[PDB]
Amino acid sequence: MNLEINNFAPAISSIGSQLCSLSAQKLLTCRKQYGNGAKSFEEFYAEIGGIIGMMGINSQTPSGIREAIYRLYQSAFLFGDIFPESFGIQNTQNIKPPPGFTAPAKKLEVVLPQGGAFDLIYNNGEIRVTTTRNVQAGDLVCTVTFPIQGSVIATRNCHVNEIGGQLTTTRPEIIASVPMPARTVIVASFDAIEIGYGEGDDLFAIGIAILSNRFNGQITPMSRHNYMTQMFANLPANMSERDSSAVLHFAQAAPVVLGMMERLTGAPKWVLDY
Amino acid sequence: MNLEINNFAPAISSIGSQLCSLSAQKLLTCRKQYGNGAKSFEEFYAEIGGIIGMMGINSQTPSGIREAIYRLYQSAFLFGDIFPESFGIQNTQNIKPPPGFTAPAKKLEVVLPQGGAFDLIYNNGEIRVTTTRNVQAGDLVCTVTFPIQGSVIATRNCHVNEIGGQLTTTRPEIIASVPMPARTVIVASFDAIEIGYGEGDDLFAIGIAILSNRFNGQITPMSRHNYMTQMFANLPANMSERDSSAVLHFAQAAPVVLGMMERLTGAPKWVLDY
Amino acid sequence: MNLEINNFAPAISSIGSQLCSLSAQKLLTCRKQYGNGAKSFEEFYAEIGGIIGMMGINSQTPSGIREAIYRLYQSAFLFGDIFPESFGIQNTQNIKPPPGFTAPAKKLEVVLPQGGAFDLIYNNGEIRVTTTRNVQAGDLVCTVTFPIQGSVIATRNCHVNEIGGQLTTTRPEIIASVPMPARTVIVASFDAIEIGYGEGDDLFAIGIAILSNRFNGQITPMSRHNYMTQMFANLPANMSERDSSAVLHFAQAAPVVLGMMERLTGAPKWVLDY
């Protein structure tokens, strides 16, 4: 999946997230006032679900919201560079902090150092490493590339910099504490939260297909974990962590809302409470 | 941590939780109508985020809520068993029930029988012990000190009381069921819920520092799980489950709200819907 | 720490120093007019101490001052190309001189030239090296890189260019006077004042963390001495001694004021009397 994220992404993402929030709040309101009748719920929503109070939509229909989402996504994640890097937008338009991430870190992503001295397998929430040769205490065995935050549980034959059970840094590295003979095993489990949101995976699966049909060459169907890892990997290096969260919120919310407009079920708290 | 909980902790907690819920609801109310102009959201919240009608609070700015939270926390959990006459406490018996716990029990807390007979290692949600010496069927192996409720999965070479896969008692005990020699290993996994509220873990980490920079002699930064284990261990023996629930709800809500008033993101459901 | 100081730094630094001085003046004025009562000191300060009226600060709360400090600091010292056109930056033709430095030079920076012929250790007020081989008279053994100014006391087996007790140059160099055998020790103590100020170090510790939590990838918390040495080393070569003073005054005034707004204690004289 190849995509070019510019320096204007947070500004577009704020508008996108506001549109998604308003669309979801309308669905819960329409959903609360449906009375069983000849007209189905799909028609009932499609007849009044697009009337929302928001500038920038040129239609009072769900098609208008869908096209607004499409154009915002294309401008933010696929078009490329807009304007010189010195163009000043943050000063006049401030953005709103997105909700904190809630996705549990199950398949935490790590990279082994060069030398082929270690064997890596994955588990539910931990990683265990097998040593092919003798290793001296106090050297890198692993390091995470996908940021993570939370508590730490059940470290064996390794030491992680932490105080009071809480990890000190968002990118911990695993180091040994005792010299290990070959064929030893060292484990590290974390009760932590990765980048993303954990609710609304059924909606994401069909929304990503909906928006991959249109951008066929750029976006491909995939799981939420892979999508978010690639989106985080494509973020510009010279960008704050306060804006990366704003970009990622819209990046995951757009497929969720697209799939929500098809399967007219509820909405996740993260999309609604923006 | 060192801290003393007085007999009137539920009365203080029932006011602190109400104040926290009021502040969170006001935060979302102001977050819904943010103008998105030249002023940032921090200035907007500092200008219109206060509560004006609660007895006990002496300012219409957020600082008033912060100072009230500080007073209530110090009175309820710290060494000074000072009864706050400033907030109006009319009945110390009436206590609105708090929401049920939602924290998954990943690192379950267990203690060995003291015979030095088993080795203890942890995992994502299960404990497993290895017999150092020969053991006969029908004797204690492990017992949990942190109360736990939920289901039981993957019980091998051990027995727990269960009805339809559900745990009977809140403090299950693991007893071997078969004569098992030669350093064998038994496992016990639980799909259960411990004490506390899993949601909003990011705000807890930033709020515990805020309230430890003030009560540095009594409170230190740490993870939520250890904080709750110690807080539950410090509860008086003459305490019902209806009251300890309120005490623990306030004990977790205070750091979460303190950290939420700094990072103006959303609020967890268990704080809003108290 | 990675940072790029631009040519426009003095204009930003003048505004930052003026804002910090105004904040300190307001803090002391509100600290003298506080009568003990129902409201705590922080509530009193939040209501009136925050109000300060300059172009570009749009708030009567301390949050506005905090955001203004953040924006000016990011514009002046951080990597992103940002300039705040909203402040009184257009009429910065003339810049008021900043107060002179008062930081004692306890750990002064020197560099051994080459050949590993000398081993360096430090003391509270003096430096000393051990010659590992024969040395000729009148050659360079060490030279300072961090500028100092003051008197010289207790020089042994060396010579510095000083007349009347005062060092003639801001970058003194030490040269041996007599050919000396291996294992000889030359010493030089200075009663001088290095760059930066001395008062307010408690506020610096809690302000550097505050402004490192925001720019989490750009600034790492550390002591004032290393901070100032890196700031001086990152100054452009083509800068006068008058503008660099303003830049280095703002670079320290920002963290100390950020920490002062947290702990509502007094303010340093150099911050206030700008």
Add this chain to the structure above:
Amino acid sequence: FIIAAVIWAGFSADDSYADIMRRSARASDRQNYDIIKAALSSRKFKLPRASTTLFDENEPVVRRYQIGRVYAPFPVDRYGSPVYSNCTKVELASDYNAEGF
């Protein structure tokens, strides 16, 4: 710029109305206005300037065309508080003397 110059002619120690009007050559109207506005929000002088913000509240109704935001002509805020660009209260430590007025 002309309003600002007329106001500043009576508060500056040295420059007269013609001297301020002459500043048109070595600058722009916006830049000169910014300079004079910064001079009127200093420690010595504080003259509040009327300001306004964008407005986005609309009552929903079915319509065919698009909608947009407009500034509010009046300088009061949604909550009734006055909106000023530099300061909330007038505090000037001198008298306005210009050309004998």
Add this chain to the structure above:
Amino acid sequence: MNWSKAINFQPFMLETRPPLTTIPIMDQLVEIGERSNQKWSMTDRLFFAIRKINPIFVTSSQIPSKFDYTILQMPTQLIASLKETLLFLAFSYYLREYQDKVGQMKFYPVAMKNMIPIVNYLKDRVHNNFDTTLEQAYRQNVVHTLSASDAFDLLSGMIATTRLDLIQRTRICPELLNVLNKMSFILIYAPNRPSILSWKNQS
């Protein structure tokens, strides 16, 4: 458009228009542009106006733009001088009051030499004390150091037009004649003087 006269469709001017699906989004970004002071002029102090002069290379015409902030370059290796940079800046500034603001398609002149090094030099050589304006820099570096014929020869090289083509074309398009007149150029062919071009009497 016919309203855009015929100057906007000259060989040395390139038309730009973003992708059709992104046009509504680009419109609201440039609105935030005018809300800020993201524009430059000739009658303004260089101290800040030098920051907002950022020429870019035109790889493709499908690029978004603000009429008061956009300066284009051809992807070449030749490096222009300071006088050429000022001449092109004046030309581009005075040429944008014929911009067609109703039709979405904007038209900009394209410089045939690189302008980045001179812009960086000016941006690094500018201080808080100096009060120089872009127009004053143009005057003291072009009008008072070169003849009108030499300045016209320089200007042509920046826009890839033979001075003969420009001189002949001024006789057909009065808009170009006004644009050149705004730059202190005067074209009187009635007497047989040595040069057809001269600078305008100032003050």
